[PDB]
Symmetry: D2
Subunit: 384 residues, 4 copies
């Protein structure tokens, strides 16, 4: 079984809803990240065998958004590309799929990751083709429907988080303290340059000027516990979940170059980390199973990226798995940084791997999504 490594890991800044990246289609974010990921790996476009990218809000983006990103990045037209939708899991699942294809003997170099522009999601008229006949109907927000709405229970993902808060008995105060810590860690990380290596600038050329976007926009610098304590609940009357202890709606692309170890050696590439194990192979058993498959334990881990869609979910996973919180989300998490759904799993992988390199941490975990069959996790070991 071939060893599989991460050659490069790059992301755009994470934009806020309707703000810095509103005018930049997901496929263009993806192209910008691909082009740079190839350059950082020290390979040529011709060396890439396949492109596999997460994207959740595909509506109206045109045929095969991953292929569009590939093309717009300068990759040969003949490189096959596919777009993967596993909602929250999309961006990380492309990385493990890449590893699987490499293990199967069918490729040596794969561009993986994800892209999302939630700011640009359409509205839909579902019955426009054959007609509404009579009566008011729903003008459907496609971002909510395709990205945020529980298709079975018929409520917002925010309601699942409220149920997890109740079930694990996680208070409003515990959630807001967790949020404030994410905010603080993100602020110092940004100000201390921890994201400078991993972020590729996005250049927006107007008719009249150019704007460069290279900094994560979503963090609220100078956050306070009092500010958080005043917030109104987002999802239900008397809820614990607010806009302040949950992530946002955000825009980003995050891409990694995944290679066999053998090809990386052949191409002179110095790999960042090796992919030791992944969830494909309590209710957080994907994460537990990936750790076990690595032959590791939670105590052994040096750094952990555990996504913060909701503070209540992050805290439940952390209590159940007994994470040392000093090693969790060291540069801030999704409450501060944002949750661009299709790209989010890849984004935290990009952040983990750069953090491992900067901090000399040997063992890393990236985990996100919760609930049976949705959890996605990868274990990384730093290349010496």
């Amino acid at each position: 079984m071939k060893e599989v490594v991460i050659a490069s890991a790059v992301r755009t800044a994470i934009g806020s809803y309707g703000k810095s990246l509103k005018d930049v289609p997901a496929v263009d974010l993806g192209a910008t990240a691909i082009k740079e990921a190839v350059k950082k790996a020290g390979i040529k476009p011709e060396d890439v065998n396949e492109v596999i990218l997460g994207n959740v809000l595909q509506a109206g983006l045109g045929q095969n958004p991953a292929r569009q990103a590939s093309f717009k990045a300068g990759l040969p037209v003949e490189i096959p590309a596919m777009t993967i939708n596993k909602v929250c899991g999309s961006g990380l699942r492309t990385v493990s799929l890449a590893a699987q294809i490499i293990k199967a003997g069918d490729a040596d170099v794969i561009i993986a990751g994800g892209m999302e522009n939630m700011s640009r999601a359409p509205y839909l008229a579902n019955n426009a083709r054959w007609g509404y006949r009579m009566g008011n109907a729903k003008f459907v927000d496609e971002m909510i429907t395709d990205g945020l709405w529980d298709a079975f229970n018929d409520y917002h993902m925010g309601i699942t988080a409220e149920n997890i808060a109740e079930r694990w008995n996680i208070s409003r105060e515990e959630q807001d303290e967790f949020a404030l810590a994410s905010q603080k860690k993100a602020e110092e990380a940004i100000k201390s340059g921890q994201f400078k290596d991993e972020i590729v600038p996005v250049v927006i050329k107007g008719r009249k000027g150019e704007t460069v976007v290279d900094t994560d926009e979503h963090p609220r610098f100078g956050s306070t516990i009092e500010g958080l304590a005043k917030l109104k609940p987002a999802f239900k009357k008397d809820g614990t979940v607010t806009a302040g202890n949950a992530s946002g709606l955000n825009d980003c692309a995050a891409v990694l170059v995944i290679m066999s170890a053998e090809k990386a050696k052949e191409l002179g590439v110095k790999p960042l980390a090796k992919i030791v194990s992944y969830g494909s192979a309590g209710p957080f058993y994907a994460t537990k199973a990936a750790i076990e498959k690595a032959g590791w334990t939670v105590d052994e881990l040096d750094l952990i990226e555990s996504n913060e869609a909701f503070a209540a979910q992050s805290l439940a996973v952390a209590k159940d798995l007994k994470f040392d919180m000093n090693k969790v989300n060291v540069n801030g998490g999704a409450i501060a940084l944002g949750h661009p759904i299709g790209a989010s799993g890849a984004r935290i992988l990009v952040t983990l791997v750069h953090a491992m390199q900067k901090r000399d941490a040997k063992k890393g975990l990236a985990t996100l999504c919760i609930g049976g069959g949705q959890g996605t996790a990868i274990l990384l070991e730093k290349c010496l």
Copy 2:
């Protein structure tokens, strides 16, 4: 490494645009085919490790259409699922992905295939979220944009078919004769029961009555060469491509149970065929290379399913690879039967494997899509 087999192969009937399946969401078609594939394979739903389904027109379908199909089929909620979009290749690429995952050692049993309901595609308002400001705008046909429109050339797929017809001198008459033979072959296949093993009925509950859909409705029985010659070009003035020599807009799901040979033995499954090679591993080099990797030649093949999106494109492939037309699309092709894009690759593989069983044909090829990076192909060898 591991040998990979097809345990079962099932599809719904293919509906015509706005007709028999207009009221059945893609996910429900998918669920129907999944449930029956699992039964036909003689395994339990809990023996399934992962679900991978193609679906192109995902807009407004809700989170993770593959997951919804899985759950609606009665598969355990904790089985992971992902939705794949590769446009034309989606349904067949899920089968090779399954084989790759099994080969990597990460699964024994995977549900693969695809689903599409083109009749139900929405219209889109792309700038409803932050506003149109002023001026008329496009009310977007999501089916055309996401499924049928070339994102780089900014024209319809139909133009590509015209381009191929032009470049190869595939005349209107030749395309019409090909279309007629496809029509005649579908009619005889349907009337002789050739699809009865592979079709799972769909049950539609009306207000009073259940309706059963179990027959492919797109074929135009009694078609004639004179009828086809009267039609007007559909895509360009003085063109060759018409409604009559092109496939339709169609609704279907097609699902296969893919397993390791070793797990099939263990579970007492009698498999239908072995997957010998696949495209991921002239301008139709994907298919050529797939054929070579199996150790075969085109002459050695017993049956061939080569998708008919457009007669022009099918005739171009057959000419280039020198197919014996007597072995091609023996039960009719997509011009007669329909082209439900996400499901189509899976649909032709379902029709191939049953036709191999019935006709005692040892070596089979399924191929669809044209152009570098897009060709998808699978070679099958029938099990003793």
Copy 3:
């Protein structure tokens, strides 16, 4: 001051929702009726001083639908035109407005009436211009909102009819018997040619063929009391109002040439009737006051057109004013014939004046709409 006469009165057939006139814009219906009214009056288009037409569902019809009808009819471009919206009263109020303008000394000849195509009403996105921001919204049925929905009570017009039925004890059986008689009377009127003088054919050019629409299509011939008793309440649980005892959604134009008596003499016109009084000059005091202003009583009337939007409302008016039902809606009413809102008041006046001519009835009343400020009524006296 001046006496005011009706020179001519013409209407299109009334189409059913989504049927015979679905392809004919309101303005084209209006143009057809205008052109023929002018011919029937025996005047020249240039003798016309002003055009005043009712139209309720104006959305997306383009600038000044009345003006478009005028111009499409071949009236001189310099004739001023205006579109009036009073919902239910629109078509009849244009006739009294015409009389008022003539009485003020500012015109001799005015085209009045109304037009509506309910089948063609749009759907609306009210927040498309500056954006929805987030969340599902309403895709608005403009026909219901602009035409059928009570803007103060925020319920359907149908609820008002239920309210009246409730308050007056107008039972389901009584409403159904009224509906049946309306059906029977329309059927006999249509079959006996009673509408042949007043209907102008509409010519629809299909791709191959012109189609002629010249017959009211909404009546349900062969209706029976048992058929009506089986229907379910349409507006509220255990209601009295049904599809069967209420009017439909309909398409029509109805136009009258209104002139001073002195100009009619001058131009050699033989007028059909004199306008004696009008509503603008119990809770049906508009009609009562109109009757009194003519110097008349209800008993003195020879024929009455009282609009049937809902049987409940028609029975309430007839009870209160003590109409002799043998003189009411002698050729059938709106339950059978349809209720094209903008045109309806004009339509019933057209049917009244021809019925007076045919039946030699001297004194006529046209009345529609209910509730203070909304009642519209006109009294006619036939010319010798």
Copy 4:
């Protein structure tokens, strides 16, 4: 023939497109103006006989927008109301219609004028009811279609203005100088309080605060000829018409209390002016005809409001009629102040009448719209 007078004249500020009045429905603007007009006339709500209001963009505003405004202003529910659409002519035509009804003997007190909120106009889906079937379609800007688009020539009203510029040979420079003079006069008028009497404040109550809008927003203070000379043409390549020498898209209501002289005497009302004549009764013959009907001449006039939809149109009318430009639009015109189409005619009447009172000008003209059968004009004589 009764004499007819203006008891009161009130308007909201004129808001800019998407700005100060974006959140205030036309009917609420109308209600605010009605309520104040009644108060300023020194009458009670009960003294009003009828409500007649211009409104062009009625789409989705609900049943009978004029009646909604009446109700929301506190006028008795039983007062009849109608909504008039003559596009550009709407707001002034309601005033002459009011005069006609009063002359005919049918009312003593009428609320007239107009209301428009162009910022709130919907987008439309015209084929949503019965379906689009397949293919992209138009998402229709209803403001452009119903308010600004020539229904016959199939181009923007801006193109008519370009044609008038060419026809009368009115240069870009002449147009921009006219615009700059409008801008300057508007700026001094605002700053010198000339609009303080006529403007009623609009109070926008948020969830969290109140905002008061009482000043016209559209003027560009400090305009310069160089600034205007740089502007790009708005409507065609190499055009003379720009955003700087044409009016905007704007929001306003303007209402007047119109009474017989006899009723005004009876109620103790001191009238502002008498309505001497009106266009209902070269290509600017409505204006010429109204002047003649008054028994006046252009030289006799003391003040003139001639609307400035486009500088090119304003200049053509002024050259043809030989206006003394020192008496034209003395407080600025529509280029500076805005063109809220349904209300615009009434707005300039409101401005004329207050200006006549402040400047002691005896004879006034209000004129707007151009082209056969569209021109609307009124002549006023100040009450001593």
